[PDB]
Design a protein around this ligand. Sequence first.
Ligand code: 2U8
Ligand code: OLA
Length: 409
Amino acid sequence: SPVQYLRWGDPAPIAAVVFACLGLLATLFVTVVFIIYRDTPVVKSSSRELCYIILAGICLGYLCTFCLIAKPKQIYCYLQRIGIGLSPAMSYSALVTKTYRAARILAMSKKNIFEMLRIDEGLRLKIYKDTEGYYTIGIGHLLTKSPSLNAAKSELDKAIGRNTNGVITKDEAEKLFNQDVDAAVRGILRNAKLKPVYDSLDAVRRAALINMVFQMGETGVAGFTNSLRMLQQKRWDEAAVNLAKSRWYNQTPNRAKRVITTFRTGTWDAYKISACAQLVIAFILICIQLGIIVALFIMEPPDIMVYLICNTTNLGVVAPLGYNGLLILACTFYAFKTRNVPANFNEAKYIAFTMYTTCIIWLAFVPIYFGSNYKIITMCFSVSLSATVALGCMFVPKVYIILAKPERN
Ligand SMILES: COC(=O)N1CC[C@@H]2[C@H]1CCC[C@@]2(O)C#Cc1cccc(C)c1
Ligand SMILES: CCCCCCCC/C=C\CCCCCCCC(=O)O
């Protein structure tokens, strides 16, 4: 009885239970909310099936302490290992597919703007110089500022990752372009006249704005004061008419006509320019962790050594800890890639933050747990902590909006 130890002077098992109980209630609350309001845009805009898997993984995470703190039976030693291993696996391996999808979608987004400026501005598959004599390649991508032709080739190989000999491909030129796009966005966000307009526009209309920036510069686009205001107020037809009078339109009519049209419709008409799969992939990554656990049940049969001490060795912990580490490492990679993506009510910002802490939690777990003389309690807190973080950062801000701010919804 957890009360006995609490009264004998040890509040560790009673605390882990309360922690686990409060966690289960919290997870139960969140899921029910997502069920009732499943049709609300804040729940509809994300993969609902994946969230259910993440919420299920966290629930088992809290249930883990009930196997770590239990009456000494044989199967509880089984439930411990199958729980501490699979519960993070259910959460992170479903979260990686979510982030990976968000990474491909973003990459495909940068693909369109690349094809846009390839048509509007052009491209060179070998090294050249700009109007100021500096070595350049691709779509106006500066390589270096030294007169050395050798210097440019060195910088190119480091950027591409191979011996290019001053020659690249379309795909490699897009890579260099992605950098210049991000740099352009950085400048726009730091420009007081361009920032409000950029924030109001959709994905397509933002590319048309960056198009203008790459032609005239920031200090040039800011000259379209009246037109920029029209775009911000979503008055497309008035913006197009106003832009068609500019010196910019009369100087480069062929290109300007396409950019203006993109502001109009918010489509790529001027330019020639899966859910079920995610569940299967998530299922596969979970079964891999299960195969590891089942194998270790065979290699090293679990046996009983309030506290339930089992005979689980290092290898019985290290292997599923390492696999979970990869799931975490992969998630962070894609989450950091999509950290600024505003889809789903700035969802990804919260996702990235969770993966930052989880890496610290995982990294801290290794020296702490393996140097500890109180392993069971340190395993209870560790699992309940990283489960709480994933619940507090990813789900709570969505529950808040859904219950406290239904108008925002
Ligand atoms: C075999 O041991 C492990 O693989 N680990 C030991 C501790 C545990 C895990 C790896 C990452 C950190 C951890 O503390 C956790 C977790 C967790 C559980 C359920 C839901 C969520 C979102 C996270
Ligand atoms: C942020 C997480 C990224 C790191 C993932 C790296 C994966 C490495 C795999 C396994 C490392 C497990 C460490 C176990 C060392 C054994 C210590 C001991 O025996 O006491």
